[PDB]
Amino acid sequence: LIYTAGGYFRQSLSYLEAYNPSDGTWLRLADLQVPRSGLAGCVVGGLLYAVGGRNNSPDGNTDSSALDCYNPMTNQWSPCAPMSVPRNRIGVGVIDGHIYAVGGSHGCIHHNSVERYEPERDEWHLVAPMLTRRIGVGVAVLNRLLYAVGGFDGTNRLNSAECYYPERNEWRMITAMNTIRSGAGVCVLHNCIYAAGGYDGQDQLNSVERYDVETETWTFVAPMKHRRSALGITVHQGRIYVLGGYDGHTFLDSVECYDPDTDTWSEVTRMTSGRSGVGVAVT
């Protein structure tokens, strides 16, 4: 269902929760081993993976090198070998049932580093670095191409996007978005790369825009009516769901729903608690 692992509401969270819109209710499961915020979630071969993040607690602020693996009928987390480096505000994509870990920070260091994980093998292997250092980068998969979108290089927030070609192991810059976006929600809906909300350096954004690969074009769609960055994002029902985040004053519990064929947003639920920086994925 629509799960949300980790997050932050005054401290990094252990929560693992589900939400289905066909039943309108939530299923709770095994808390994260280590609390995490700024993580990313994915699903490979059924299993929900949690990559990077950090544990921002009253007693520390540790960037997470770790990849951990949840089994929906084993309901157990098990550690899968750590990454090259810790990656707070990481972005992840899934090609070929393999996981790419993109960017993120470790302390002052803003990564361009990228690396890939192999679920049959439990191994991480360094790959070609991005052209840009990116934290809060959003990541998407289209035609088994991997897109790194937006983010923050440590000084500037980014509207640039760049494409990873796996069988040439290359990054090439593509057309920039119309809006600068760091910590936006980036997903794939229809066959457009969606980028929703984020932070442009001044305000959280309610605007949303989508990339069409054939025309190399970004187009703005209906905006959410709550600006939000550090949101979770996923598509269920062929419909967009955005989960929590931060709006400058409050940790949102609002969950919004975008219908593409009417191009309208509508509130589906409120989360159990307002929180930001969750990892989302579905299996």
Partner: peptide
């Protein structure tokens, strides 16, 4: 702290 995440 990061103003994008509020932490």
């Amino acid at each position: 702290x990061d103003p994008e995440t509020g932490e």
